[model samples]
Target: SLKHAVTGYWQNFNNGATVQKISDVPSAYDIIAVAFADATTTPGAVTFNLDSAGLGGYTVDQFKADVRAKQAAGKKVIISVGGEKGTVSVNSSASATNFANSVYSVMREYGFDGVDIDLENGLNPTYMTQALRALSAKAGPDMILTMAPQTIDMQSTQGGYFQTALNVKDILTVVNMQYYNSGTMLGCDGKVYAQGTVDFLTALACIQLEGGLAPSQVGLGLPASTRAAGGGYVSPSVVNAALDCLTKATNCGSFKPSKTYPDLRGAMTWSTNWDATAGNAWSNSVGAHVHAL
Candidate 1:
């Protein structure tokens, strides 16, 4: 089973607006995903700019040193593709190859350990599987492949995002499905749960846990604060309660798991910058709770 972890997204553009440097991020986060390598302009090209546009005046070398430092401390730094408005999709075989090569290029250029597929628009399972497989081959066995699919996208085992994750489950690390920004969704028990409550977090996570994914492959994704998402923002304490319910089958609400998932991977937030803005409350509290698990 994978060790309990706290994954967070570090917005590259939020420099000065929130976090000024990569080193400003708390050391508690295990996996820090640098938000958004632009996949909209060029169909097959994935580009990341480390200038002031994204890195807040930090030079490429400065960022590299920080990333290396984090790795030395046993933390992973990865690049996340797509966001709320990203337009990346692998529709053809050639595009799939292009996508793989472009992502690999970014990984080599920045020394990122792996890639996170956060494509919010949509994705094609067939070509996406091929592209991710190619990237994984280049990244080797230690690659930390992850995803941030929306709640609705993972409601069924046959959905595109679900199929893609299952197709690459051998190499995939975890799927932190975004449980916020979503209103009402059906749980595995056929009960409709509203977002932002423990019921929503537990019931929705159960969908992925029982759908086919191993407990270690599922995680809870939430907004760091009320500003981080369109809706569904819960406190760190609520998040911990949900985690307890999923991992220990305790502290549950109306819907409880039939069995425990002690191996359940930990939680994730929308952006580390937001967590920083909130005085690192999410990471500070949630990180400690995950370690205890």
Candidate 2:
């Protein structure tokens, strides 16, 4: 049977002075994505200076040991490229090659199991498609490719992000659409659904479920707490309710999926640090709930 997964972001360099170490994260998260590969300074370039420093607190060998330990415990740790202010644009073949090579280099250097494309700014479908295909070739068949596109970017199949997703559906592991930081968006029912509500989560997720993605490929993303995002932060209970409505078509809002997708992938949160800040409330509740699903 296909079981649900809990993906959480691990911010290497966060707002506060203390950088989060990989070992500090909880085991409840099945997949831990290291956030923002530093695409601001050099376009398509991802550095590990901050990550090294965070790991420097311990030792280089310790970092490798920790990552391997997580993997041994059945957890995946991957690198997430692009963020709210990232500027990695794949507009040409050369840039696409650079993107793929750079990402693969980082993946090898850190022993990251895979890569997550969270390009918040925007993307070029043609070149990005080329880049990801090249990356998949280099990483081999087991590469765990994922995405965290915003609500608006995935509302329509014609959108660049959504198209990119469809372009790499074969290699794509999951599409965790970020439901926070988005004020409002269209649902599959062709109606406006406001943020911070169960209706919003269920209806918007339907858009992806019906938009050429399998139930196992779509996951609902949310802020771990009010501090994680500017808005659209709901309690874990609200997230659970939305998941139930989407997977079983029960306890639903006014809008519901045309048919229940019992194999819906699972849930994702903005950052594991925030979940820890909230005393691991998000993962403790959501993680257990997903496993049950």
Candidate 3:
């Protein structure tokens, strides 16, 4: 596992932000999650398509080479499956097996170290847990398994995302729950907190902390800038402050955790490309703070 790591999603298709080659992603990121693996027509299988043209002249060969480059530099460039509109179904045992086998082959073909579960539409906890276990069986012990569940999806262990995390506790790396695009949520204190405050980051984080996840397996995920998400966009400094508040119990807001977690894992952003548009302010500051931890 990585030490207080920072994760950033790399957009495959250009979306107004700076279009980056796989090699161009800033070093502040410890793990660069490739934005998506689209669902295939065959059951739960998925596929990746690097928009070579959309990424400004990058080639498939270069994309593969960059994966090795980042790995050699001690970074894990894992493929993130699904997103806000994700539709990679794993509802049945058959689909679950397909999910695992296909993802396993994809990792080998693309040279990815592991997979990131970011399926946003919804999921079946039982089958997904089964699928992930099967994938890890082929992926071996060093495989990097990560998740990017939204705020609501992790509100309770009964939620599919949360259940999957608990089911795979022994193999799970980090669950960087997206703390943006969520207007308001109940924190561990049972009080509603607005999305953009340090209080929100810390208080909501308490659920996962107090929940089944290890402190090292919970990372705060946010948008890189105001334009990165429709709501809940905090400044990079606020992200750092929340980190300090969670781990050190310093720089806290009106609400403080009952206990400190210095082993708390770091933070993640929506996209590294968006960070470029914001002059890399997000990764530059938040990444330094995470590494310092």
Candidate 4:
């Protein structure tokens, strides 16, 4: 079972952001999954860069320090390699080899435990699985190699594509599908699928099990905030009522997954920024699930 929610926030972290204090947030929620960055780096290939100065980029040292601080404070950290709309042809196997080697060394140096891959580039364009495999192998035992797969239906997408890579067995720890983003209901005002979460979770669990995963290896991913247009994308708005808002439809209700999929290992919050204490109660919700498990 997961001990805490892997929460992420791009805006909250500054180059010199006080990481020592990060423990306070994790401690409050008993956070287990330390957040990850979205795609936009090396889209198709496994190349990673944070040299920019916005919410989306950071130096390797800064991120390492972030991981170090998190680990030092009693939290496990994982690096997310890709996200929504990223390109994939930047790094090749040879380059990937060198890059993985460097990443491995740095993660070891910083005391990071593993990598969290979010290959969301889309289907027909995943040649870097090998590079990821190499990285996973390099990360080795003791490190948590997990993938944040897209919703079950979109598993073929780069981020969701895991079945093809023989390398998956060595790296995958948990497959956290973006449950809320999967599908809400018919004409519910969200871009998600048109089904209830129960069906989606059940189907996904069954598929993963068929693909050779133990039940305990499965987990649920819920969103605290959502967009209002284009079928609901990630939104940094107040999320306290987001889940409730989704439930305003016929099947959605009660921001609880325990009653539905009680066997779920744990849950993950989309982002740290949306979890404002006053709005989403994001930390508390994730913590409640962790403690319950």
Candidate 5:
């Protein structure tokens, strides 16, 4: 089980930040999601294409070796599908099968432990569920499945991302919803909460814990640094404060939950490279906090 897990997105392309090999990611991250595999023209299929040019000549062989090294260290390295501009569509059984097989094939090629659903654009709940179930059957029982959906996409169990998460709960690892980039949202208590605050993190996470997912299936996804996102940049201390409030009912704001979730998983960040840019401040503080929890 991924209790109190900490996840980070490993950027493959250089956005003028620290470009790292897979194994070079800080040890604080329990799960490293390779930031984005590409969508293929074949219906819902996806493929992995490392930006060697952008990553400063990172070769396929070295990338694969680093992937193995990280796995050996008991860290999960998985392929993250989609991002802010992802357009993968899966609404039919054929597309679902294609997605499953294609993802599995890529998983084998890269020795990925599993796949993460970070699709920011199109998502069909039923078909994605079908696609994931098919993937699990082929990937066996050890596959690690995760999702990073936007805040609004998980407000209700009926929402596409939430429903897909609920559908694959048996095999689903966690849903680290992006708490940043969101303007404001209605919490489970019927009060609206804004982003970039402890109340926003706790109150919004309450919706998931109370809606259907177990405490271990939910985590807080935040931007690692100010430059990491356009908005919602809470310092690592605030991230710990949010975790303390949710799991231990301490360090809360005006919107504490009715009850505590001691088993609440942990937190996630947009990209580890940003943390590097910030002198590893995010991982050094938040990582120790999560592991301690």
Candidate 6:
């Protein structure tokens, strides 16, 4: 019974995770980028294969075609590399240069506006700086280099990607902190978001401020989905109830925006696809918020 019920709940929740779009105000979002996975050597050479078929089927040409379409439509299309499956290893300075060359080649050849670094476990302080700076150099002016780093407060536990990139200020445009707020998985459990979201975000802005990054250059990250203590994922409906329970009814009465930082440049989502009918869509809600920013 427990297994069946849990499975049912997760299935239902995932069903809600498929609606990915900026239904109302599309123009409000400054950029719309999706992370691509280069799971295998062959396909990795091609599409970065983030689709129904594997990497080979998607192909680099196909990837650029799609991105160009979006760019022509005015979306600042970026190709994000490195995730659970696509970990780019920055083993040595030479390797870092190769990685940067590869990244720049793809973006430049395809006319992509930018590249988003989502390097996983293999990144280090030195290589992080070298890789980003090398890519920025080849990218020239008007190309963006952003990152989806681990949670901001959890930086000490992570590699010096945050601090390393902090020094090479000219290379990056934004750092999207993972505000998944789920225990060690993210920086916190959403348990703290009631009082802590603002606190956490304030810390991020302050960090960038201390690093000399302009307020308009940082992107505040938020989670589109959450996993419950029992391991059943939090559905959009449940999250909506949680938000209302905390904010609307004044249960979360003492909350206030932090005084430490100025308004942020943008807000980010872990995945835009997770928003359901009951929940404000990730891209939509974030676009609404960033538009005001």
2 or 5, greater by TM-score: 5
Clashing pairs counted in every model: 0, 0, 0, 20, 0, 1
lDDT of 6 by residue, 1-293 (tens): 10000000101012334433222213434565556535334312223433433222444566557666655665676667775456457657776776777777767676767777666655577776777777778878778666776653334423466666566666566766554543432212222432124444443334454455655455655555552122223333332222332223321223332233333455555554443332445444444433432
Provide the overall lDDT of each model, using Cα atoms, as 2-decimal numbers. Answer: 0.86, 0.85, 0.91, 0.45, 0.91, 0.48
Better-scoring candidate (lDDT), 2 or 3: 3
What's the C-alpha lDDT at position 264 in model 4? 38
Could you estimate the TM-score for every candidate?
A: 0.96, 0.94, 0.98, 0.63, 0.98, 0.67
- Model 6 gets an lDDT of 0.48
TM-score of 2: 0.94
Residue 4 lDDT, candidate 3, scale 0-100? 81
Candidate 1 Cα lDDT to native: 0.86
Question: Between 1 and 5, whose lDDT is larger?
Answer: 5
The residue pairs found clashing in candidate 6 are: 181-188
Minimal lDDT window, size 10, model 6: 3-12
The true-versus-predicted C-alpha distance at residue 219 of model 3, in Å, is 0.3
Residue 176's lDDT within candidate 3 is 94
Candidate 1 lDDT over residue span 1-293, tens digit each: 13788889988775343765677778778898988898746565688877565554788888899899888888998999999877787878888888889999999998999999998888789989999988888879999998999988888888889999999989889999998988799998888998899999888888888888988889899999887888999999999999999989889988888889998899899888888788888889988998899
Off by over 4 Å in 5: none
